[PDB]
């Protein structure tokens, strides 16, 4: 895995910001794209754009084959059994809302529980808050251990025979914790619940196998895994999708439309109303080809190396707190003593370094951590230890700078 050759394929990395080489450490907010993806969108619009399905003309057939071809690439990439289980959506957040609307609101009654965790992103909190309110069900939270991991004993305690849904992040976008999803799914199913996995931060960075995880639903975003913005996937087990009604209604997802009553297409098109995200889906297929050619296991090993190196170098800094466990995904969320994280991020950008400051869409977790905001550097397949050295050197200089004033 050669990082010079990988970085050569991402044109956006090769520029300066405020007279310094760009050091982009915000891939957990969104990833950059290689030429293979950007040129896939260009070839689509330059050569074979047309509306899809009902193919009667040559470009329409090409666009259709491109779109459904990318559906198969996604199925194989997460090891789903069938394309009927692979729904294209505009992103993880819409995918989780579709489960909350079509699955939860149809299957919750007073006394039923939805169980989530304190480390969830808002996308995997607020849909459930709304579904429980709509149904008169109850929302419960699995507690965290002190290092920001989840113990399976707490899971077993929280999940009961009244639990109908457990929803949980695969990887936390703040703590970098990798949650024990396959063992959580067993505990959910033992209790009669389904498990909904928010895979937005795992899919880019490590192999996903939905048959091994045995998750009932899994959600992911293209823009985090070198793919175009505006597209995502909802995977669901086919027997659950078959029984769920559509979340949105219109052309393309019908079989018959009468004046008052309509019937739906088979899966997966039952869940894809209107002209679909044609270019974006084909470009997400190109991103999957690109990552597969590098190897997700290789990208996970590179990130493990960067994270171990970052954690060590952060421990060399006085007056810096890092949140979450030692074993983690490729990101470090932190605070400097006595400097607001927004000011940390502002002065890092003056040195060309891009990081994110705020609550990272995890307000209950910031409350759990007893902080109002944090800064986060996150890494991906094009980042290097030299960039981490630049970050830690800039944090040192930030600390001294705010000391002198």
DSSP 8-state class, residue 265:
P
Bin 167: left if φ > 0, else alpha if -120 < ψ < 50, else beta. beta
Number of Cα atoms under 13 Å in the Cβ half of residue 295? 6
Measuring CA to CA, which residue among 18, 27, 44, 119 is closest to residue 383?
A: 27
Cα–Cα distance between 350 and 352 in angstroms, integer? 6
By the 8 A CB rule, do 77 and 233 touch? no
| Inter-CA distances, 215 with 104, 174, 298, Å | 16, 22, 24
Q: What is the DSSP-derived secondary structure letter of residue 175?
A: T
Count the helices and strands in the chain (H runs, E runs): 15, 17
**Least CB distance from residue 234 to its own copies, whole Å?**
13
Q: What DSSP element (H or E) covers 322?
A: strand 320-323
Q: Which stretch binds its own copies (CB under 8 A): 188-196, 243-251, 321-329, 383-391?
A: 243-251
Q: How far apart are CB 64 and its own copies at their closest, in Å? A: 12
278 binds its own copies (CB under 8 A): yes
Check 13, 361, 371, 373 and give the catalytic one.
361
Stretch that binds its own copies, among 71-79, 125-133, 288-296, 317-325 (CB under 8 A): 125-133
Establish if 33 lies at the interface with its own copies (CB under 8 A).
yes
Strand partners, 336: 320
Least Å from the CB of residue 309 to its own copies = 22
DSSP state, residue 267: T
177 and 328 Cβ atoms separated by less than 8 Å: yes
Residue 361 a catalytic site member:
yes
For residues 35 and 384, what is the distance between their CA atoms, to the nearest angstrom? 20
The correct pick among 3, 36, 83, 126 for binding its own copies (CB under 8 A) is 126
**The one among 1, 15, 147, 157 contacting its own copies by CB under 8 A:** 15
Pick from 9, 32, 135, 179 the residue near its own copies by CB under 8 A: 32
Does residue 1 touch its own copies according to CB under 8 A?
A: no
**By C-beta, is 273 or 308 nearer to its own copies?**
273
Question: What's the closest the beta carbon of residue 15 comes to its own copies, in angstroms?
Answer: 7
Interacting residue with its own copies among 228, 236, 285, 324 (CB under 8 A): 228
Binding residue for its own copies (CB under 8 A) from 195, 210, 213, 357? 357
Q: What is the closest distance, in whole angstroms, from the C-beta atom of residue 137 to its own copies in the complex?
A: 12
The region of 44-52, 202-210, 316-324, 331-339 touching its own copies under the rule CB under 8 A is 44-52
| Residue number, 255 or 297, with CB nearest to its own copies | 255
Using CB under 8 A as the binding rule, whether residue 265 contacts its own copies is answered as: no
- Is the four-CA dihedral 208, 211, 215, 221 of positive or negative sign? positive
Selected from 3, 7, 8, 17, the binder of its own copies by CB under 8 A is 17
Please tell me what DSSP assigns to residue 12: G
Residue 6 structure tokens = 């990988």
Tallying the residues shown for the chain, one arrives at: 405
The Cα–Cα gap between 229 and 297 comes to: 24
* Binds its own copies by CB under 8 A, chosen from 149, 221, 374, 383: 221
Residue 36 makes contact with its own copies by CB under 8 A: no
109, 301, 315, 342: which one contacts its own copies (CB under 8 A)?
342
Residue 342 or 397: the one with the smaller Cβ distance to its own copies is 342
Residue 97 as a binder of its own copies (CB under 8 A): the answer is yes
- Torsion on CA atoms 376, 382, 384, 387, rounded to nearest 10: -50
Q: Which of 319, 358, 371, 389 is close enough to bind its own copies by CB under 8 A?
A: 358
Q: Is 230 in the site for its own copies (CB under 8 A)?
A: yes
- Within residues 46-65, the interface with its own copies by CB under 8 A covers 46-51, 54, 56-60
Catalytic residues: 361
């Amino acid at each position: 895995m050669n990082i010079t050759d990988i970085r050569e394929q991402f044109p956006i990395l090769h520029q300066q910001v405020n007279g310094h080489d760009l050091v982009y450490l915000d891939s957990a907010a969104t990833s950059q794209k290689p030429r293979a993806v950007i040129e896939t969108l260009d070839k689509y619009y330059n050569q074979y754009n047309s509306n899809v399905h009902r193919g009667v003309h040559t470009l329409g057939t090409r666009a259709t084959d491109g779109y459904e071809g990318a559906r198969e690439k996604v199925r194989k990439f997460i090891n789903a059994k069938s394309m009927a289980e692979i729904i294209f959506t505009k992103g993880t957040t819409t995918s989780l809302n579709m489960v909350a609307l079509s699955y939860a609101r149809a299957n919750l009654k007073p006394g039923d529980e939805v169980v989530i965790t304190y480390m969830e992103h808002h996308a995997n909190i607020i849909p459930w808050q709304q579904a429980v309110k709509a149904t008169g069900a109850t929302l419960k939270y699995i507690p965290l251990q002190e290092d920001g991991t989840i113990s399976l004993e707490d899971v077993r305690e929280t999940v009961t025979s009244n639990t109908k849904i457990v929803a949980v992040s695969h990887v936390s976008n703040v703590l970098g914790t990798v949650n024990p999803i396959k063992e959580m799914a067993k505990i959910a199913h033992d209790n009669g619940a389904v498990i909904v996995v928010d895979g937005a931060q795992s899919t880019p960075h490590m192999k996903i196998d939905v048959q091994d995880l045995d998750c009932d639903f899994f959600a992911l975003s293209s823009h985090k895994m070198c793919g175009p913005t505006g597209v995502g996937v909802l995977y669901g087990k086919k027997a659950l999708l078959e029984n769920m009604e559509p979340a949105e209604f219109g052309g393309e997802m019908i079989d018959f439309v009468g004046l008052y009553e309509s019937t739906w297409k088979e899966l997966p098109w039952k869940f894809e109303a209107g002209t679909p995200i044609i270019a974006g889906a084909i470009g997400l297929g190109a991103a999957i080809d690109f990552l597969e050619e590098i190897g997700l296991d290789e990208i996970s090993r590179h990130e493990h190396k960067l994270a171990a190196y970052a954690l060590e170098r952060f421990r060399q800094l006085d007056g810096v707190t890092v949140y979450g466990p030692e074993e983690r995904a490729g990101l470090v969320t932190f605070n400097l003593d006595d400097v607001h994280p927004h000011d940390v991020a502002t002065v890092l950008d003056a040195e060309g370094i891009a990081v994110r400051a705020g609550h990272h869409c995890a307000q209950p977790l910031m409350k759990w951590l007893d902080v109002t905001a944090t800064a986060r550097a996150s890494f991906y397949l094009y980042n290097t230890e030299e960039e981490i050295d630049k970050l830690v050197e800039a944090l040192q200089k930030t600390k001294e700078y705010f000391t002198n004033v």
